[PDB]
Amino acid sequence: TYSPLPDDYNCNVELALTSDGRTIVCYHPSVDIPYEHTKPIPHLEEGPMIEQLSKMFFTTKHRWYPHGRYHRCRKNLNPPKDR
Amino acid sequence: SYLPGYVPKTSLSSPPWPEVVLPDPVEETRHHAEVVKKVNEMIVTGQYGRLFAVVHFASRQWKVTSEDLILIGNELDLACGERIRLEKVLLVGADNFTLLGKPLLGKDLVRVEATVIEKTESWPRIIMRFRKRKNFKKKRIVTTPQTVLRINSIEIAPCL
Amino acid sequence: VLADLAIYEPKTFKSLAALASRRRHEGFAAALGDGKEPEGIFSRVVQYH
Amino acid sequence: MTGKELFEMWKIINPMGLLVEELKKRNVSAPESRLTRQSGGTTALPLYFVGLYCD
Amino acid sequence: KFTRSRIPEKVFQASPEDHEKYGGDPQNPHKLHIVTRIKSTRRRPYWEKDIIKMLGLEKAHTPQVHKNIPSVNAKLKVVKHLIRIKPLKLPQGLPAEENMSNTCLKSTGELVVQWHLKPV
Amino acid sequence: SSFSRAPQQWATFARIWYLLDGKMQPPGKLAAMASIRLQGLHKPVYHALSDCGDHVVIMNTRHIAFSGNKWEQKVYSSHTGYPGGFRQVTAAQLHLRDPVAIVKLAIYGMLPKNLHRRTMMERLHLFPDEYIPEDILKNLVEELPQPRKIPKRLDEYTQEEIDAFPRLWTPPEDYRL
Amino acid sequence: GLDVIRIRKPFHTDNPSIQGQWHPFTNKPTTFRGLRPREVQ
Amino acid sequence: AGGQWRLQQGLAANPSGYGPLTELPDWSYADGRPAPPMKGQLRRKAERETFARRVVLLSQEMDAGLQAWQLRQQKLQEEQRKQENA
RNA sequence: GUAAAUUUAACUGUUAGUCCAAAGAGGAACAGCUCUUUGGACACUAGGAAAAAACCUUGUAGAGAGAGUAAAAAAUUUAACA
Ligand SMILES: [Mg+2]
Ligand SMILES: [Mg+2]
Ligand SMILES: [Mg+2]
Ligand SMILES: [Mg+2]
């Protein structure tokens, strides 16, 4: 009955060794979210605009100001995509 | 009535962490073997899907899978297009289980095959050693050898 | 890999943590009695030669 | 083909409609969508973990 | 001023308490000292750095063997505080000619003649 | 996984709203756990370049307590800029004027001194009382536990615990008390 | 046939994710009736 | 980490020093053929080989020095008998 | 136990030296003070002590998105009386 961690949020975990004791194996099927643990489904100018979207996105006003042409040209237009 | 070493309930009477007790070893041995054999027939029946693997090679680890590229900072003296079987694996794992070693897994358990595809001279890495107000400066450019491997496929054996 | 394993399979890293936590209780059981007891099942070591 | 998953090249319309159609071929009931977890609902970055349950 | 420090020989006389601790039996004493460097050669007198070089331990974490005799004892005594010392003991007899290549060292000072590289 | 590219990447680097009750907690320990959660160190995918920080909400910042006489010993000093503008205020006086203050400048020291500091600071939220607007109260995720246990008072200790606890000594009857 | 330049990383994985990539809600439980903290209904 | 624990059992404090983590071959042919030894493994074996040849040289010299004294003492006891016999 | 040493042939440059530890001298048993002797560092890289020349770890150089270690984080609260 003893368990090392609560097996109720991520996966039902159990460890196991071969009888010789040279390799360790694990069995961790993911938990099933019960139905009880769910819910039913159902202009302006620079000053006012930069602060209201900052209050909307929860960030500062600095990054929203426009940068110079020096940085706009240095931005890469064909960046490499992974996968 | 009370043991001599007994103490009433306080904050420092017992440690803050909760007391625990480990299970008995005999039923654990039957639990160690039972959970292994159901995993053994699981892989024999083929319930698993992908299987990733960790590898010790060239004095450093990598997490790898099948159909994935990998680079090494030296030459192995292998012709391009040749296949090789890697010996060392720290662990391999599927969607619902994992096979960890002590430290590595057995030879007969796994068969990790990988093909060599490509070999570059590394891009020119420049180095400059400089010291101030003493006219000590120097340059050097290195192009170390590199090789590109790819793990074609990984498989596991029923032996366990 | 220990970090990268936690990125993509937390279920695996949970087994590593569960494996690690069990060794602590085995080590604390060894702290109570060093010898004169059956050693930990996971604390058992492999001897190379 | 290893790189791109199914719905990258094979785009589809009304996926849940196609889902309920396929589930009737497989002889099971009509599932219901239920938000399991939520974060930032009133925030401009809403986030919902919707799960489809049948029976 | 600072000079070479002569050590009393009485300090290097093992008592029965020390014998039971390190398990070194006085009779049947070992022959060879496994030597390894830990402390840096720098910030030491000229006589301390050249001796360890004369012993051949400029490299750290490099086990190197010396004799257990009073002559070489004086050398690594004055620079004893730069190195580790561990005795040599082996169960498998001296290394035979056939097993010259398959040798292997251990952290416990052992030197196994045979090394087949897999567990029991 | 079997998740699409953009939705999976969105859920990984998404933000979450923590909640904490400051009743009988020290401002340091709640600041220690908060600061690591503000950069996103708790995320295994942490990277300082990627602003993967998460919001934090504190309640009952008025009902905080120090360990020691730091209500009197500790001093919070600042300088306006003018001559004589250097002033000092005890933690008690600073608490009477602003109960939101003690934590906000306490976390301010914990997190690093970068330009991401002020972004993470405003992301954090504070309230002296347990009354919250429905907007910021609805977008919640999880309430992490408190660092320290709160000791119970004599009126709180039930009778069966006192009876279980054994009396220790005999009082002589000849005593006024 | 590709230009020798710096490589962003020394390997490439086409299917790096097994068992589901980590999101914040992997390692925490759910709530009875699906309730946020300090919520009646 | 764990260096003090590894040397407790006799293992290397650094696992890269010796043991199966490095001494085994790091690659082999797909057909099961054995790969050639690595440069690190070759110089390590040559180091241990000269180390073994050195230790055998050190031991036999000490044994030759010990017996050479006792052979001199037997000669010493011999000539003392010669003195009283004369 | 080690491999350097003496001599020969031909030159160059250093010959304006600060600090630490110790034995001393002058001075105030003053100086980041001055003058000698033994040793070390610095005027050669790197890590730590906050930034640090001289303190503490560490030398023979490279690639690595490998690993194990070295030195390495200040502790203190004080006074009753027939
Ligand atoms: Mg001076
Ligand atoms: Mg001076
Ligand atoms: Mg001067
Ligand atoms: Mg080196």
Q: Domain ranges in chain E? A: 1-117
| G11 vs B: CB within 8 A | yes
Q: Which residues contact E33 (CB under 8 A, 6 or more apart)?
A: E65, E66, E67, E68, E76, E85, E86, E87, E88
> Do A35 and D55 contact (CB within 8 A), yes or no?
no
CA of B136 to C1' of I28 (A): 47
Alpha helices in chain B (DSSP H): 25-45
Question: Resolution of this PDB entry, in A?
Answer: 3.9
CB atoms B70 and G10 under 8 Å: yes
Q: Output the CA E40–ligand 2 centroid distance in Å.
A: 29
Q: How remote is the C-alpha of E11 from its chain's centroid?
A: 18
Which of G15, G25, G36 lies closest to D49 in CB terms?
G25
Residue G26 CA to residue A10 CA, distance in Å, equals: 6
CA of F29 to C1' of I72 (A): 26
Residue H24 CA to residue H34 CA, distance in Å, equals: 11
Q: Which residues contact C6 (CB under 8 A, 6 or more apart)?
A: C13, F44, G22
CA of E42 to C1' of I54 (A): 15
Name the phi and psi angles at F6, rounded to 5. Answer: -65, -45
Alpha helices in chain D (DSSP H): 6-9, 15-25
**Beta partners for F89?**
F76
The residue range of the domain holding F18 is 1-177
| C16 vs F: CB within 8 A | no
In 10 A of CB C16, how many CB atoms? 18
> In terms of C-beta density within 10 A (0-12 exposed, 13-18 middle, 19 or more buried), how is residue H33 classed?
exposed
| Residues of F in Cβ contact (< 8 Å) with C10 | 44
Q: How remote is the C-alpha of F1 from its chain's centroid?
A: 36
In 10 A of CB C22, how many CB atoms? 20
- Cα torsion B31, B36, B38, B42 to 10°: value is 160
End-to-end CA distance of chain B: 54
CA of B135 to C1' of I16 (A): 23
- Reduced to 3 states (helix: H, G, I; strand: E, B; else coil), residue B61 is strand
CB atoms G34 and A82 under 8 Å: no
Q: Using CA coordinates, name the residue in chain A closest to C21.
A: A4
Experimental method: cryo-EM
| Residues of G in Cβ contact (< 8 Å) with A83 | 13-14, 16
- Count of domains forming chain F: 1
Shortest Cα distance, chain F CAs vs residue A61, angstroms: 9
- Reduced to 3 states (helix: H, G, I; strand: E, B; else coil), residue E85 is strand
Order of all β-strands in the sheet with B91-94: A14-17, A24-27, B97-100, B91-94, B51-57, B60-64
**CATH number, position F153:** 3.90.1180.10
| C48 vs H: CB within 8 A | yes
Which of G21, G37, G38 lies closest to F1 in CB terms?
G21
The b/e string for F4-37 (b: 16+ C-beta within 10 A; e otherwise) is eeeeeeebbebbbbbbbbbeebbbbebbebbbeb
Alpha helices in A1-83 (DSSP H): 46-57, 69-74
DSSP A16: E
Residue C13 CA to residue C1 CA, distance in Å, equals: 11
| Residues of F in Cβ contact (< 8 Å) with A83 | 5
Q: Which residues contact E47 (CB under 8 A, 6 or more apart)?
A: E4, E78
